[PDB]
Amino acid sequence: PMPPSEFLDKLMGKVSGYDARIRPNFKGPPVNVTCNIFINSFGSIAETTMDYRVNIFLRQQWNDPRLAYSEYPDDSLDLDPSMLDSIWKPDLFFANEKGANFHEVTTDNKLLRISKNGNVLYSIRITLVLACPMDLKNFPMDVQTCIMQLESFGYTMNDLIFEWDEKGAVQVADGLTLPQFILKEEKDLRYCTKHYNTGKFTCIEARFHLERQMGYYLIQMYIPSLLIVILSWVSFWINMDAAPARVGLGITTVLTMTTQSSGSRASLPKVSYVKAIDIWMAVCLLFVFSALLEYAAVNFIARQHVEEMRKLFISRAKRIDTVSRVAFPLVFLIFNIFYWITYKII
Amino acid sequence: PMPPSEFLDKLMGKVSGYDARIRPNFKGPPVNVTCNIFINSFGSIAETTMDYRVNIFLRQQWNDPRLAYSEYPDDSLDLDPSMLDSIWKPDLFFANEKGANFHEVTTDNKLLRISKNGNVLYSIRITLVLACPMDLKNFPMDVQTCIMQLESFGYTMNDLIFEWDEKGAVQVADGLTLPQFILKEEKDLRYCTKHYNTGKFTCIEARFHLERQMGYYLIQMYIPSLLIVILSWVSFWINMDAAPARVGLGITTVLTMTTQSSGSRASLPKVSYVKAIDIWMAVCLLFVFSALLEYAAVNFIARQHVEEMRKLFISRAKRIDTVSRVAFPLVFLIFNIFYWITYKII
Amino acid sequence: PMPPSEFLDKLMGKVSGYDARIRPNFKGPPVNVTCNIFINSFGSIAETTMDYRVNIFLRQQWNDPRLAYSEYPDDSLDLDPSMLDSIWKPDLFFANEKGANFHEVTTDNKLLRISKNGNVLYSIRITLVLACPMDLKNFPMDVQTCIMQLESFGYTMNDLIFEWDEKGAVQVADGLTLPQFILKEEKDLRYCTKHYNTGKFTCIEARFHLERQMGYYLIQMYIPSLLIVILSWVSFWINMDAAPARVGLGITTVLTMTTQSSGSRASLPKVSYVKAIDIWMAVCLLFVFSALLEYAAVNFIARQHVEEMRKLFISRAKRIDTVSRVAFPLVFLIFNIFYWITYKII
Amino acid sequence: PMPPSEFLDKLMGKVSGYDARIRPNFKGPPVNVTCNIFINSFGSIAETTMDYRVNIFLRQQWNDPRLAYSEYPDDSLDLDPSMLDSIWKPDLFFANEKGANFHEVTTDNKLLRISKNGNVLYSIRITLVLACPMDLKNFPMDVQTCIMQLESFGYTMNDLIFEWDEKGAVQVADGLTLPQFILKEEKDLRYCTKHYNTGKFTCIEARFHLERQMGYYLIQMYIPSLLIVILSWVSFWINMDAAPARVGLGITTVLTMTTQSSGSRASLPKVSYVKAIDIWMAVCLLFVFSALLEYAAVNFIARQHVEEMRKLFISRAKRIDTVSRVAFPLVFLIFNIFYWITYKII
Amino acid sequence: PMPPSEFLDKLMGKVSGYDARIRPNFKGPPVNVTCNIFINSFGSIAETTMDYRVNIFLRQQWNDPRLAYSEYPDDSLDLDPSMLDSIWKPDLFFANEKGANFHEVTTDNKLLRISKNGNVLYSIRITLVLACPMDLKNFPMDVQTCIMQLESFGYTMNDLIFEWDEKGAVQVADGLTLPQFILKEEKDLRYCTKHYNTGKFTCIEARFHLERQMGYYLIQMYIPSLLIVILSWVSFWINMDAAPARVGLGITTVLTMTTQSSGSRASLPKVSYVKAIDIWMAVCLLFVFSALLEYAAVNFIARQHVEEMRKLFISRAKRIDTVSRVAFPLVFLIFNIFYWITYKII
């Protein structure tokens, strides 16, 4: 017999009329390319740019009847990646690329094998920086849906149709963890067929659901925003005579709370709508600012203090501290129930 | 019959005299290239660099009478993108590129089809980082106009003329949203014909209007700049005896206001002129600094306090707190009306 | 005799049937490629991205019986790196590349020599940015294990098998130091054989253990977090009459401690779990917040002060300062023993 | 007649002996290349890196007598940019490149036309990141001089001489504005002929003067550094009895002034010399620190207060507040005159 | 005669047997390549990455007896940089590259001339980002030694030997200044011959000494760390009765000093050892913290005050303020002498 690279030069050379610019089944039914991906790495999900970097193995399988040998005795013929300019390949691209590249270290990372009946496996390694629009209406408790979609570019729907295969169309690597998110195991697979004025082009896509990990935000920006509210409660257990204390406590807490509010959106996109970390800060702004306005009611009623009625005006000024010691730590707990039930329903 | 790639080698080969370095209609009328773009992605509109990243499909259509076949029975002949060095193509470029690249993942993202009469469609995918000069005179309420312009580089006006087509010269993708801006639906299309000492070169351009979303700035830098003004009002409801309080309230507010003023321009270009976020901070600097100077009038008139006249000097010192409780929250509201009417007219 | 480049064109030319697309020992036993690396540079171990940049010399040795000359008198024949497209080479790649490149300054940095029996040495220079998942459960005292793994891409296990050689499979450069870490001298070498639906592909890997240097974190974020706890102790040595002092000391310390807590995770990945620098800050939050609640017990018992019993209520209010001067600096030392024994066992 | 690309293959082919490796007028007088640039974009003038990004059209004109046709009837023959490897071109480079690239979007952005007598116009588009050493001795009021210089690399002075042309050697685009600087209209043009041990190489250069816009620094770092000085003046209008006030005012101002001093050099190169923004901060450090030392003279003379002499010692302690209310706002204005006259002369 | 490019095709063509893959003096003595560099630009010496960017002209001279013409009448023959693949060139590389690139703007920046006896000058332009390990034990007063080393990659010591030439082996450009450092004029030149298991490879290197400019650190982080120590001295000149003052002065200074300590290492590598800017901050931490503990001794001895003995206990409490006004500004000056003599000896 003869070696396969000399045998594949007979299948692809000047003889046999194989022309690599012409799709299989020409002037016939369209080419049914079936696809599946294998996610090696995932992550660096930025939100300022609203993008995420994935690192996939893109496998494509089609049928090319001109490559159907019957004399060489094997069942699969590998190609050198140097000879990948010699067969037809589908012009797949990603409709939200935002920059992508191959991997060409120590060899082009490309695989190509040809079965006997003409089935062609073609596996390459791609690094993508895909774009997904973030929806941050409920921000530490959101379930993002970042997608990726695989169109054709030169061939219309009556020449080339993409399909996901039925045998596990999206595999994920074995120990693929993410720092901030978790990747849910149910991955949607649906069509996204595009219509332009050039024609109608095929498109398949895969949705990935990325549920967050709330445990980070629960440590940096919910509990230190809950202690400073309790500092504003301890002004109530000091008498109406340490005026440099209860004012100075109602100033340093309400102005370290503004730093918490501005520091809550340090690395976020400047979205117009109000998000679920903003109706925690702008309500805990309100509790630490109502503790300062409580003392400004005490020291104003007390300075208004005729003997008999003003002894009750001092007693009116102590009756308001027998209420705000109980009202504020049991209205803030009513809000703390209406908040966490709202975002564990929506 | 014969397959089209063998047929197009007859239209472009050594026979028939087709020379890819020579424009259509040579020594004749100029080539009327008509253009339209399709914006896939838009955004990352930085203002430190004053640029924005767009991701377009650039379609070009011209007429090439040497490619007018009449024997092959179809109506459109696709090319392989490998054979794009074999026809004439217009040397379009972007006059404010600032860096740009093609997309070459799994295939060169290029499309080329040739009709029977010689009409050539040519669609490529480009990522641009275009430069637009920002005008930030009224900064959270501005309507930017960031443009893009498509010149020729080697052919003058008497050889190649660009036109926008009449059938929707700028399409935008279906769900294209922006984080900070909104893209207005009216897009200007006008000529920008350049004159150099080399010649006069054709140019068409498209204006994009990018109205901001004020809802972000309304949460971070208008309301926390409006609470700290109200902290400087609560010094008035404390008597002229808590000297560590009303001074300490007129210091911490007026120096957390400087942090608001410096934090207002954290990620902005260092422009020379004064912008609409600066005449909100440098007026709310003035209200929280006039509350400190109000107490320095109280505690100086009171320390000046002969029995009969100085009892009115204490009463003069309380008459000024029966005025500044009403004057300052009803002069700040007069400014708050003159401000928001001014920037919802201009 | 004749020069070696004319001699190697006899070994690789049109004569002798050497085909560079066909592995050695075709239709036979697999090719035993043996590998070892030489780490020139190491480091820039980022944790936001969870990656590290290495700069290696990748040596590969296999056996190619078609290159076994016997007439030329030397024992080793170098190649020009221009003629590296003319022999077979293993298609090694790194299964966690995340971007990598060759070095091509003044010459392609590639080495290739061929012995007499057919042994082929092949040494190239690669810069890698490898991905390793960080485990930060005990963060300033952790021993990371960042790995690198060398698969095949086109050849399955029955065609190409990777091995580490027995003579020092991972060398490290002479004075290779790291800024933050130290590289332990025991390096694990184990197999990582992959199974896909394409086939089973060979894989070898090398574990690197990266023990940190605790001496940085001991200066920035343990001792300044230990002085501010001692500032909250000095409130106890001031009487229950300087109410602007002991409150103002129990506010500035407990709110500069929040800046220490937020500044503790300035450049860290937003992990969900709680790490060993967080149960030092959120316990030293508790000591500086219990010094403020100690005074709120003193000034509330003292303001509650009938002649005989209230003289003991003042004495009850001084008995609590004869306890908290000794309890708090000898409970914080009990925690300071339970902490550092826990993370010098785990 | 025949088309020009077939005509230029007669001027440059195997016939006529045109060799693209050999300069015009060989073994004769040097080639007089004349140059002029056209600045499309300018800016991103960083000072940490001390570089600036320019985007030019580099036009070069020389004379090549071997390209002097006389039979083809036109007056100018364009080239395809694909055929730019076929004539001689000057090996110009930029002696302070620091990285540069061409622009190759939709076509190589290169222009080449050949007149009848042999004059060759050659216009390319380059993006440069040029290096200019910043001189920051007087920092918000400095006039930078950032240059660019165009040497030869392989040909010495007796083979190739660069010249600026007399007809406007540096053009600037129509609406080219800069965010921080303004580009003065007088641009110096002078020679920079280099001497190495290889030979003497030609060099021309163009100076650009970049006067700043002081209006940004006048809003962020001169007026907020002028209000905090006036806060330190308002300690004088409070009596010598509010010891928590005048000390607390002489501490918060003098320590928010240190943040102004460190925030003054947030994004500057760490230069050794003292600059004009540093002798404004380190003098306004001195005024807000002399207001604290003024009170430490008052409360120390007052606590030193025998009946008759100490009544004047209280009166000595009020005589010092009848001086520092007028001395400090009329010594700070003497400095404010010596400062702004000094940097509007130098 | 005939032009040199036709003459050099006779020296390098199919005739004369010149093979560009075979070094000069084959099967003979090694090739003595002599080198010297010319530093155009230097700097951007980062310390987070521990690297520095240099921009050199690398000149190499060797002897190639096959290029020794004797008939053409000149003394030097330039090459086109297009014909640099036609002679032998040494495979030099930089053993600490960390990324490097050529410069290819308007022409490949390469020079090549061949003398009559066969001497070959070869000058290229390279941008390097070289790695140097920083030693920061004495950080604002350190003399770094950042090196660069030039190995061979494919040829061992018995085939190719690098040498520095005796006539000024490292030139520096005329006005090369650095922002933070100064480049000392004595540059060490020494051998660095490497031994691997492949062989022994030649290596030469050049040390550069980079003495810092202390004048920046003397303005930002020594004098503002020296004023805050003097603020902690002014607590001594206020009596033991303004308890909100001397405590509030011993809190704001000792907690703005922690910001100085954390801000001292904002842009530094996280090294384990203690550096000379850290034993200035952590000693000026100690002086501003001993001023707070001095008042906690005063107000505790005074509150301990039977008539006769306690009048001396008040006098004991004023005797400690007649000592700490002189002890602390004359112990801090003893440290300020032991510090600056220590780092101007080491």
Ligand SMILES: *[C@@H]1O[C@H](CO)[C@@H](O[C@@H]2O[C@H](CO)[C@@H](O[C@@H]3O[C@H](CO)[C@@H](O)[C@H](O)[C@@H]3O)[C@H](O)[C@H]2NC(C)=O)[C@H](O)[C@H]1NC(C)=O
């Ligand atoms: C690629 O896959 C497509 C399906 O997505 C195939 O298209 C379909 O092919 C059938 C022939 O097998 C076409 O004919 C139909 O046959 C059924 C009987 O099986 C008959 O009941 C129908 O009336 C019709 O005649 C069918 O129209 C066609 N559908 C479309 C939408 O094109 C295609 O054949 C596959 N091509 C290859 C090369 O595998």
Ligand SMILES: *[C@@H]1O[C@H](CO)[C@@H](O[C@@H]2O[C@H](CO)[C@@H](O[C@@H]3O[C@H](CO)[C@@H](O)[C@H](O)[C@@H]3O)[C@H](O)[C@H]2NC(C)=O)[C@H](O)[C@H]1NC(C)=O
């Ligand atoms: C490309 O489009 C341009 C228009 O932008 C065409 O130029 C114009 O072509 C006409 C011929 O159709 C020229 O002749 C004019 O004809 C009218 C009658 O239709 C006559 O009234 C005028 O006096 C004149 O003779 C016209 O001068 C020309 N205009 C310009 C500015 O060049 C051009 O023909 C188009 N080329 C192709 C190949 O489609």
Ligand SMILES: *[C@@H]1O[C@H](CO)[C@@H](O[C@@H]2O[C@H](CO)[C@@H](O[C@@H]3O[C@H](CO)[C@@H](O)[C@H](O)[C@@H]3O)[C@H](O)[C@H]2NC(C)=O)[C@H](O)[C@H]1NC(C)=O
């Ligand atoms: C590459 O290395 C592999 C080992 O990883 C070699 O595979 C082994 O080769 C032996 C022949 O030397 C095969 O035959 C065995 O021989 C022993 C006697 O030595 C006999 O007791 C066994 O029953 C068996 O017949 C062995 O099966 C094979 N093992 C595997 C897993 O393939 C291989 O030969 C090496 N190839 C080259 C080109 O060096």
Ligand SMILES: *[C@@H]1O[C@H](CO)[C@@H](O[C@@H]2O[C@H](CO)[C@@H](O[C@@H]3O[C@H](CO)[C@@H](O)[C@H](O)[C@@H]3O)[C@H](O)[C@H]2NC(C)=O)[C@H](O)[C@H]1NC(C)=O
């Ligand atoms: C390129 O430009 C240079 C000038 O920068 C030209 O060099 C000068 O050329 C003249 C000939 O025209 C040389 O001869 C001189 O002629 C004058 C009379 O015109 C005579 O009085 C002098 O004594 C001398 O003979 C002159 O030496 C030469 N100068 C230099 C510095 O080389 C050059 O000819 C131009 N080349 C081309 C191809 O245009």
Ligand SMILES: *[C@@H]1O[C@H](CO)[C@@H](O[C@@H]2O[C@H](CO)[C@@H](O[C@@H]3O[C@H](CO)[C@@H](O)[C@H](O)[C@@H]3O)[C@H](O)[C@H]2NC(C)=O)[C@H](O)[C@H]1NC(C)=O
């Ligand atoms: C390149 O430079 C090396 C030196 O680094 C040259 O190597 C030395 O060459 C001499 C011949 O000139 C060798 O022979 C010695 O000659 C002296 C008399 O001059 C004699 O006393 C010694 O006993 C010895 O025979 C010498 O061994 C050799 N040294 C080494 C280390 O190789 C080399 O010749 C130069 N090559 C070229 C092409 O310039």
